[PDB]
Design a protein around this ligand. Structure first.
Ligand SMILES: [Fe+3]
Ligand SMILES: [Fe+3]
Ligand SMILES: [Fe+3]
Ligand SMILES: [Fe+3]
Ligand SMILES: [Fe+3]
Ligand SMILES: [Fe+3]
Ligand SMILES: [Fe+3]
Ligand SMILES: [Fe+3]
Ligand SMILES: [Fe+3]
Ligand SMILES: [Fe+3]
Ligand SMILES: [Fe+3]
Ligand SMILES: [Fe+3]
Ligand SMILES: [Fe+3]
Ligand SMILES: [Fe+3]
Ligand SMILES: [Fe+3]
Ligand SMILES: [Fe+3]
Ligand SMILES: [Fe+3]
Ligand SMILES: [Fe+3]
Ligand SMILES: [Fe+3]
Ligand SMILES: [Fe+3]
Ligand SMILES: [Fe+3]
Ligand SMILES: [Fe+3]
Ligand SMILES: [Fe+3]
Ligand SMILES: [Fe+3]
Ligand SMILES: [Fe+3]
Ligand SMILES: [Fe+3]
Ligand SMILES: [Fe+3]
Lengths: 157, 157, 157, 158, 157, 158
């Protein structure tokens, strides 16, 4: 019952992303990027709400949910500049997107029209999230070419 | 530094309790106790906010946080009735209280007045939380003596 | 009483900090850093308000206060750029913190519960104050790596 | 004066009632009947207000008031269900009614028209108070026949 | 244990003070000091509210409370002037302060952080209460040096 | 101008000195339970500090280098034992704030420093107001304090 397992794992993936955003928030705060830290913190809350959405839909559709361990974030070990963090967040969102497309591909195989309809807005959110992060990362990578300049973006924007 | 250690453990414990309250709402939902499930769901969010509060203080005080795995909730698999769930949630809160007091003990021994001040409203919150859950459990245990009657409590949320 | 002595020293320490913030405001103003000047000026009034809070408590609790001289700020003479100012201010705040922690320890030993309670919000204020000065100093030190760029933090504030 | 004496005893009886209501609040609360607890709590403040009213009238009328001890409520030692509590509260109000009629009898005897006029709203309050408490007791006694049912109306109601 | 006892005594002391304040309102009213009487009456209600706050906390923390007798006030038999009343009220509050501090000592000894946190605002209120009473008494004692002058305090504040 | 810069610096010192003397006075009044008088001195302390900040602000704009001096420990408190003594000391403080403004203005006139003279003018008028008001309070205090308790009644009302 691959579909029920993938749905279950999607919840884990959402909560996993929430923790990694939190991890990014903490690294930014510890290094005095309060603007970038606030953005990561909001995204952490948003990834948790996506998870809660999946759980609620599962409850309604009698998809048994069993909550799994939420793994320790580990990219924070290696981050040493804002660019490192944003790049890890971009990889996280790309993985998020692949996991949703797998889910929707299993639903399609099983003719599970309800699940596919449920997933639609999420596919469009991922498009927007990858673009947004991609854009932030491009800015960060450009600005960090001059010492101190990126520190101006955080504060202003 | 056992203080740093206990502070990290507290963050973990708050997120752990968040997940346990989510598993409770899941079980309540799946068994058609929507009122009780709404309540657990809001407590889940609240525990997460307590975790965030600790993280924020730790950042400001240069207590380095490293996010740990959030363990899977274990007790659901054994719950059979609402009484079982409210009992596990009472134990959870009793544990929550214990670890706040341990943390506070270690702060005291260190003369860390800032940490003690920070924890005061959580100590008072814990008193309230254990009271409220104790009270709910007593009602549940009294009302469940008549078949069907507890379902009536549940349509009071 | 050493408690009495320390309580009186704390008043002087708050007024001393007010003067030193004022000295910084002056140095910033004379050097055309109006945004940083305004910020230091507001911190000078706040420090004076803390002094006054201690004085008022002392009157109420029969701690005799005798006001001491407020020494001339000395660090201005050596400041050459905004980094030097902000680093002196961070030191000032670290010393404000230590003096409050010593007062609290003296209060603890005498079982002076009222003094300990009165001090709690100042312990938490200090945590915030050090985090905030720490974070400005980090930005200032990063942005001053490019000529003129820090002058852009000041105006955009 | 028997009147001065009864007037002072009236004050004591009110403050005693206030304490007994408070002990009922505490038993309810400790036993997780928060609605019944809130009711008793509000009744304790009301009884205190009746005592203060008597005190104020006494001062105006030059009846010297000497505040007496308010004894420890002791029935809580033996309460074990809400029914026991409300039974004790009914007895309490029947006693409040009796000390009021004693005071009024003595006032009538002495032709103290002012005192009797002062007492009239209290005589009507007691009527209402005894009626309300008796009705709550009848409800509690009927509901407690089915396990759990009483609890379900502490919550919904009070 | 010492904590449950002291906690019960504290409720007793608050209700006793409530009666003592009532007793003073009585004495003032009987002697045509309506202003001072109204003030004592408000204080009587306020002490009663403190007692109820302790009771509520004890309920929540499972500190069994059993209400003790409220003794007959007895200072009233000896009061001859406003000054004697206000002197008894000062001693009353100094005794209120004493017992709070003992309760706090005992809580500290047991590491009862919740009780200590609950007590902190009462410690600060006692400081204010003793100040205010000390100050009223100074005024009464000064003003009563000229016949009839104290009747002025009363009809104004 | 050298004596003009020095006097302008001393003027800053004088305002903050006065601010601390007024605070000393608030503390003495509070400790002796004159709350009304205490609140008035505290308000004055803040206002004196504001005047100082106004001088600092003008100095900065005019490029008069300000170096902040020690603010001395107030010492009149040691001597005060009634409200009269506190108010007299405050009158003499405002009389010295006045002399010191007039000195400054004298140096500026000499130097033809028109902007400084313009800047001082409202402070000259304020000092008139301040010496008049302290004078009036001190006369009231000294009159009232001839009857025991009387002064106390008017801290409390006014
Ligand atoms: Fe978003
Ligand atoms: Fe997501
Ligand atoms: Fe997003
Ligand atoms: Fe986003
Ligand atoms: Fe928690
Ligand atoms: Fe909790
Ligand atoms: Fe909760
Ligand atoms: Fe809550
Ligand atoms: Fe601030
Ligand atoms: Fe600040
Ligand atoms: Fe400070
Ligand atoms: Fe600050
Ligand atoms: Fe009633
Ligand atoms: Fe009623
Ligand atoms: Fe009623
Ligand atoms: Fe009554
Ligand atoms: Fe009654
Ligand atoms: Fe009070
Ligand atoms: Fe009060
Ligand atoms: Fe008061
Ligand atoms: Fe009290
Ligand atoms: Fe009191
Ligand atoms: Fe003035
Ligand atoms: Fe001035
Ligand atoms: Fe002046
Ligand atoms: Fe003035
Ligand atoms: Fe003025």
């Amino acid at each position: 019952e691959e579909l029920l397992d993938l749905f279950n794992r999607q919840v884990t993936q959402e909560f996993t992303a929430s923790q990694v955003y939190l991890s990014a928030s903490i690294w930014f705060d510890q290094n005095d990027w309060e603007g970038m830290a606030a953005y990561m913190l909001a995204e952490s809350a948003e990834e948790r709400e996506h998870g809660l959405g999946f759980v609620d839909f599962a409850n309604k559709r009698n998809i048994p949910i069993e909550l799994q361990a939420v793994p320790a974030p580990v990219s924070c070990a290696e981050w040493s500049s804002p660019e490192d963090v944003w790049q890890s967040i971009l990889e996280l969102e790309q993985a998020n997107t692949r996991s949703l497309l797998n889910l929707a591909e299993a639903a399609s195989t099983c003719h599970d029209f309800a699940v596919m309809a449920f997933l639609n807005p999420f596919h469009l959110q991922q498009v927007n999230a990858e673009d947004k992060i991609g854009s932030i990362l491009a800015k960060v990578t450009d600005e960090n070419r001059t010492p101190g300049l990126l520190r101006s973006l955080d504060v202003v924007s």
